Subunit: 114 residues, 4 copies
């Protein structure tokens, strides 16, 4: 079984900590990144349909130093070692609806255990 | 005059999304109802941004589909349009379940959705 | 048959003109947008496997006033009226490889005939 | 010391992409070879940016798959890495063929690819 609970890092030296997943798949945690270091909360869910050993999942990071919001989704894989393959959408704040077209960046991130 | 996530929302596909109270930290929960004339209903959880108490906040949420192994995340902004209507402009990523990490490349879709009140 | 040749516009009052598609699917054209108006070239291909009435396609716009590049892909649909449902990636120029993570915006565009 | 598109490229999946001469307007053509141990080979066409004659230009291209009704577009930048190696960091969209405009939402994938010389 691949579980999101615990501590994770990526190629950018990030520090992601996720708490216990309840039975409905819900979780909370923390996302720590450089700018000097800031902590921001994350809330998310993990699939529990068919209790897959390698579940898909999703979460939102509500950045504390910034008007933006990021969303991540992906799958917890086994390779023996655990890895989260993710993709993300970073939403910037824009002042007027007609600037919406440029408000959204996309990318990826690979996480592995501390 | 502020744009809130709380309430009933629909899009051009007749989905109905219903969002509860946004708390002091911007957290909220809700439901995503969609035709799958057969209807299924899945929980969602996420946040809206609170930094500078913006009239048009950014936000994000995860829908944990009840009938599927997939997961979808939405992000976007709650705008007041020219006509005074509140609209959510969103983009999303839909993650499918694959068996081998070598299939990861084909597992992620992207699209968009515009929601208005119902 | 849905063909990319001709003149197209979208909700942003853009003006896109595409030339003749050869037999391998290749095409050239022009993308015109506000900033005052600038013309930039586009080169692309259209699928010709199975000669579908509603082909998928792709093109790159090489913006003339800017270091960026945009790519579009999508499908030419019939609804009697013709419409291109697209999605796009806008690539910004960043000065150093470790800023790559923020160089890519994503979005959409619907085109219809002039 | 400039990063050029011209040449042979590979990624972490053993695709081999080969790009011809970049002309004065930045246009180029090439080939994308990929396992589909069975190999298929499809044309690609696109541009690199020339505004300010940058040492690390942005670019984009379309691969017109020979064995499929799909289309894929790549965009990214040609960087000189810390070790002096040229690397293409790319993101892509893969468009599938669907029959009805109502299925359009499920037709577009997104991923990434990192290429290095071969
Ligand atoms: C690579 C990646 O996943 C992206 C998506 C959201 C991004 C963060 C968004 C907010 C941000 C603002 C900064 O000023 C420093 C870097 C950070 C903290 C970003 C680091 C890279 C992230 C984590
Ligand atoms: C258009 C859009 O926002 C997408 C993102 C995730 C998609 C859903 C993912 C799961 C799903 C499976 C189906 O068989 C039809 C309806 C649904 C419920 C999809 C409808 C369209 C959605 C809501
Ligand atoms: C909506 C959309 O497709 C986006 C993708 C690329 C975008 C263009 C990218 C370059 C650009 C720079 C400007 O200064 C004005 C607007 C334009 C001309 C953009 C208009 C919206 C476009 C066309
Ligand atoms: C990882 C990546 O960049 C993706 C984008 C488009 C994808 C290709 C699309 C068509 C295709 C069909 C197959 O059956 C296997 C190989 C290929 C050739 C895919 C391999 C991975 C590609 C190249
Ligand atoms: Cl922006
Ligand atoms: Cl940028």
């Amino acid at each position: 079984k691949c579980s999101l609970t615990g501590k994770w890092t990526n190629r950018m030296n990030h520090n992601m900590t996720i708490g216990a997943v309840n039975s409905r798949g819900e979780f909370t945690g923390t996302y720590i990144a450089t700018v000097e270091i800031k902590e921001s909360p994350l809330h998310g869910t993990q699939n529990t349909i068919n209790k897959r050993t390698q579940p898909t999942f999703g979460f939102t990071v509500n950045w504390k130093f910034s008007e933006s919001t990021t969303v991540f989704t992906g799958q917890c894989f086994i390779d023996g070692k655990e890895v989260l393959k993710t993709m993300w959408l970073l939403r910037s704040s824009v002042n007027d609806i007609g600037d919406d077209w440029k408000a959204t960046r996309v990318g990826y991130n690979i996480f592995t255990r501390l």
